[PDB]
Amino acid sequence: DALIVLNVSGTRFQTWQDTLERYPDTLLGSSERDFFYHPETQQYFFDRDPDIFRHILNFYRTGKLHYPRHECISAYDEELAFFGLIPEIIGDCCYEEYKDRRRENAERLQDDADTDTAGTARQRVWRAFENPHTSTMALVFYYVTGFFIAVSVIANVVETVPCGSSPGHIKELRYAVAFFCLDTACVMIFTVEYLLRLAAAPSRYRFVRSVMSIIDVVAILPYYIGLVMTDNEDVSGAFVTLRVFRVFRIFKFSRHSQGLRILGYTLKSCASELGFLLFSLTMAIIIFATVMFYAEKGSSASKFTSIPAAFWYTIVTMTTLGYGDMVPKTIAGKIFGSICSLSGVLVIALPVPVIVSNFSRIYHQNQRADKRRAQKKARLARIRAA
Amino acid sequence: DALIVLNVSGTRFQTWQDTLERYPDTLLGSSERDFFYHPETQQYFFDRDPDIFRHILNFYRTGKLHYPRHECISAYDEELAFFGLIPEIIGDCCYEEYKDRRRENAERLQDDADTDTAGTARQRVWRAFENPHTSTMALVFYYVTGFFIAVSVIANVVETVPCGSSPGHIKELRYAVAFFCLDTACVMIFTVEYLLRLAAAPSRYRFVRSVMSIIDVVAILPYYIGLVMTDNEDVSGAFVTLRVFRVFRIFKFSRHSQGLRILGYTLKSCASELGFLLFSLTMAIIIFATVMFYAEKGSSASKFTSIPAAFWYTIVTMTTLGYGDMVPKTIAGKIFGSICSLSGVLVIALPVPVIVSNFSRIYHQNQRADKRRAQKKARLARIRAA
Amino acid sequence: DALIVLNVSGTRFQTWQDTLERYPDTLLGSSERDFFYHPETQQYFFDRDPDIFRHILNFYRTGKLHYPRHECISAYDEELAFFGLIPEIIGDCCYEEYKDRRRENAERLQDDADTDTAGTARQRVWRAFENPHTSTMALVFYYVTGFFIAVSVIANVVETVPCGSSPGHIKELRYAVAFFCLDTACVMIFTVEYLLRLAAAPSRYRFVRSVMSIIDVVAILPYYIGLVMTDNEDVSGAFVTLRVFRVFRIFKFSRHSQGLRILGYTLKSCASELGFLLFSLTMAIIIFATVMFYAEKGSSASKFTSIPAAFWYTIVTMTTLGYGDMVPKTIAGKIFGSICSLSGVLVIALPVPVIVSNFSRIYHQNQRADKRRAQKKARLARIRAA
Amino acid sequence: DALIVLNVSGTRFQTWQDTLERYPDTLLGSSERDFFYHPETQQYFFDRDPDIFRHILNFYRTGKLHYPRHECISAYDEELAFFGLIPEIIGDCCYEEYKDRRRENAERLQDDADTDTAGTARQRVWRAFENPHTSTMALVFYYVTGFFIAVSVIANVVETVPCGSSPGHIKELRYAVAFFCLDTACVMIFTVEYLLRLAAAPSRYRFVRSVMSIIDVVAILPYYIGLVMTDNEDVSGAFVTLRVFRVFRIFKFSRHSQGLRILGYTLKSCASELGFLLFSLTMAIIIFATVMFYAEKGSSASKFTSIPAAFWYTIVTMTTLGYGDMVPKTIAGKIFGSICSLSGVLVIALPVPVIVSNFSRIYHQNQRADKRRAQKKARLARIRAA
Ligand SMILES: [Zn+2]
Ligand SMILES: [Zn+2]
Ligand SMILES: [Zn+2]
Ligand SMILES: [Zn+2]
């Protein structure tokens, strides 16, 4: 029939009734439209902003609703909810960018959700060795356990040097019981700290099933297995394995290193990429080892005695090591080793970009989170000052 | 003469008649302008959005039409078509960004075109081994053929180890007919699966000409060539080639690996880059091999006996392998090897960025496509719930 | 006193006279403002767009003029010029982005300036061997000269292989005059082609001073120097240099390779980066060679006989070659070689990102230029069809 | 009760009194609102821009204030201050981007603060050797000291070559006092230049504590220590250390090289990243050396005599050097070396992206600063020409 004016605050909008009444489910398609009617002015006064109302009216005109890139999603979805609209009908070309903006905002939302849980006898000491700067004695425990881990690692390394603990002489007086005593002490502090952590843990199951607890137990257990086995003499064999397993104490530094935890998280995130790396690596290794073995099988004194023996050459060449203990001597072997070097470079460089990008993005998340916390504290102080 | 008002819904626009009538081909330059004339108000009421109409009026003023970056191209070209305008007259400085936006949208358009073709006796089994999760027995076939490929590869590798199938003794009782039996079995399942795929293929030509079919046939054929040739005795020579060709069975994993297909696609896309890599690599190799041969020709017992013999040194040095079996002994040879290492590093690193970028963009396309499918399903469910 | 309305087409603007008259140099601060005055409406009707006029009025209010990022610079500076404003007074925070947009547009401007010069007896043949697809016989010359370059390179490589041109026997009948004849032929075609290019060159100075002409002459001249020197017997010495210089014929492929020209351009652009690479490389080499020599000087039979002799070890280690012909034997030497490997990796990786970025940006310029040409042709055809 | 109109210049805005009076602290919530009241028009005329006033009114409606991305922050915070608002209440989703824009602008602010301090007997000569292009004799001093550094480095390198300064003969007449004289001269110019710099330095403490002064003193002092020690005979020992320390004179080129200073700054900025690199590197080295030693301990004549002896193999393998003087001979050793190569590649490549990004961003800062200075000079000249 005619056109009605439905002005937003300040800027006026006018449209035909039939277009406005196409969708009766929304606020503007129902009796709420008649509710906003004003006397002697016939203007539907909405106390909102006109920019989003432009898109709302555009959605009313066509069957398509868009999303302006240069706008705040909070205001956008506030105007959507206020006008009885849903975020699931905003086209498809604009829908993906809207989802990207929503996920970027939700990242901050769950960051604040993790922040606000900051906050009783026993668990107090659990709060001690959970943030090293909460107290002074907790920091003392932190530094003491770090020093003990370091001294244990250093002693384990030094135990094998000649004239330090292994004699190079024949009949002269150089072992040390002091190394055993130092190992006993280090294991004592390690197990005491682990037992205190287990006792102070609010949830025994969550603590025990955690990666750090299993790392601690696999670091401390070898000493106990060794003392148990000493009842069955000191025969070699598994003794070498027990000696090897003592290097796992260096993994306890992940409490003292944020970078170690970031690297663990970025290795967890790229599990598919590392799996593809391993699969393509072993596929290329098998192919090139087979080709190299069959090319170098019939030499004078070739070290390519089998495909498993060619695995060594293939892995040395693909990583661009080039020890030189196994080199091809035939034309075909040389050609295929030349191809193998470049192909291994390509295989290795395939997922390194993804690993780098994930590590960089996690690192940037860490700095963005700490910067957000600091700036939020500063803003709270500034707004409290006024 | 005067100015006429041609207001879009809400916001008014006014302009002189002569400017509006410069182009009679469009909607607003013809009798359609008089059609929209309203009585007692002399306002041309267009039920569109004002933002794009601003650019339309700007095009009417000058001979130049721009494109706003902060807008939806669907709305933009809808307003262009509605007002009798063409997308081929939107300047040149804004034209390229418009084309970029159009191609980004068209990417989603053909993605939906590939999605909507999801969807009868024989071809049903073809649908079995085309998406492994469609049925339960199809997944059984998938895992069975994967296991058989793996066991064939493992047997081919193990066949060459001493004391496994090759005797290291002289007169003691170690070959195995069991290896031949396992090869017969693996080829049996491989050819049965390939024959079933060929029979169930809707188009025999498209299936046979495909890369996967030719890979399967070149993997299975060597056994048949070998059995045919056994009628002509078991003389060596091509027997080594037949043994080598058996490693191609590992290429059948590209059905089981999305990463292998992505790598194949990104190698296809970068064909020019790989060609340039090969050309620059061989050019540098020829140059440096010539220089190194002429610098190291007159040593005591130099292994630089010819330029082809210096190809080996050049390719080892350019890839930073450094076996050490061929090292320069003269000052000129050392200088040119030092230059050769860095130059080869540069040559290799020239197209690796492009290969990395293409692989990353294809990978991102894969995740964006699967995310779009999942979010479209979720949006359909949500809109069905209301 | 009061406020005057100075409405742009459609949207109205009102401001006080004193603010509008602050700058009399501009169009709106002078009698042109009174020129636009309309009767019985007191509205200064400007037939422009309101968005840029908002920034113009903002500049009139304060002493600061901004630049909207979401706008076309062509429209922006058109409104600046139309209103008597200059682009040199648009603040400083917005000035840099304005300059970036202007340079991005000017890049297309000079691209079109290079395009529009596409376009007589002699110079016609110069147009033959300047774009290979202009004619059919020019393409024949292109392929013929490419084949001759390739055969010359292949002959130069093969001339040094034993039993091909160098006898490995003692008294049996294997030199070849055919190699000399092939060299004569290749030099004949090379010099004929170069002479034709020089004759057909519109500017002899520009052609001769060009890099391609000097490459061609240094490739062809060694044969003439050799024939001249043959009058002074065939004594060795410079004969090796003449043989070496024959490999420069492979540089003529830069006509046939766009990638070679792109690499040359990106090496020219990064001259400062390559200079810094060389400087830091030689600095690190000197430092580490001195340290390694003084650490390894007093070994049993060390090959570290001098700092120049340690240059070889340092350059081998810094590039991660590791030949193994020179390895440190002392603790200090091992520590400093371990540091040297990582430091050389860092030094090499310092400017590789810049070289990669420059090569990628030049490559992207090439594709963007060809895409722009193709899309401009398509747009011209489409606009001619209507 | 009713709605009041509070129009900004041109575009009108209307709102209810209760919403406008929610916050009395601001300009519009106090008697300043009544101050702007106009007679016979009841319009609050604000001579500002409407775009930011839209966000101001939106903040008045809700309890949330947003920030438009497509706007100048100078105008934004000018409108915030003019209307009695604070930048600390602009939400949180828009707050972070606002802070990013503020820091980007402040970067230019402190760049201009460092620029404007450009600007008396003694200190004049200090201005001589602080910017080499200020005068002509200062440039002469710059080139003279560069030449003397270069000749000192060259002499130090050449002093160790056989037959140059070290005799290879037995009884024939080849040392040189000329090398000592050249060293005396170089130290003379070095100490004269350093003394002049110290005398002309406005602040002796700031100059002495600087890195360049300590570099100069550690470069010049070894000669004086040597002349002092010559009174205690010429016994070896520390003589080698004094000879080694003479290579530090090459560090004086950082005055002559902007890239050296940029590299120093980017190493200072990435101190945490280099610390993490060192920590992860030594952790991996310890782990892999322990495993390799225990795997290769029981070979025939293995060089894996201890974990410290396996440090050499681990660091050679992790950097992909591969000298080949120590190679594993057992299956376990080969497997763990194969893992070690890839793991070392990962460890090395972890912080190289961050180092590259920091160096690139510092380099881009340098070019952006010099470009800004040049364009500011050009703009000043252009505005002076009008
Ligand atoms: Zn859209
Ligand atoms: Zn434009
Ligand atoms: Zn600005
Ligand atoms: Zn917001």
Numbering used by the authors:
A (entry chain C), B (entry chain B), C (entry chain H), D (entry chain F): 40 to 158, 166 to 219, 224 to 436
From the paper:
Modulation of voltage-gated potassium (Kv) channels by auxiliary subunits is central to the physiological function of channels in the brain and heart. Here we report cryo-electron microscopy structures of the Kv4.2–DPP6S–KChIP1 dodecamer complex, the Kv4.2–KChIP1 and Kv4.2–DPP6S octamer complexes, and Kv4.2 alone.
We first determined the cryo-EM structures of human Kv4.2 alone and the Kv4.2–KChIP1 complex. Moreover, while S6 gating helices adopt a more flexible conformation with weaker interaction with T1–S1 linkers in the structure of Kv4.2 alone, KChIP1 stabilizes these structures and enhances their interactions in the structure of Kv4.2–KChIP1.
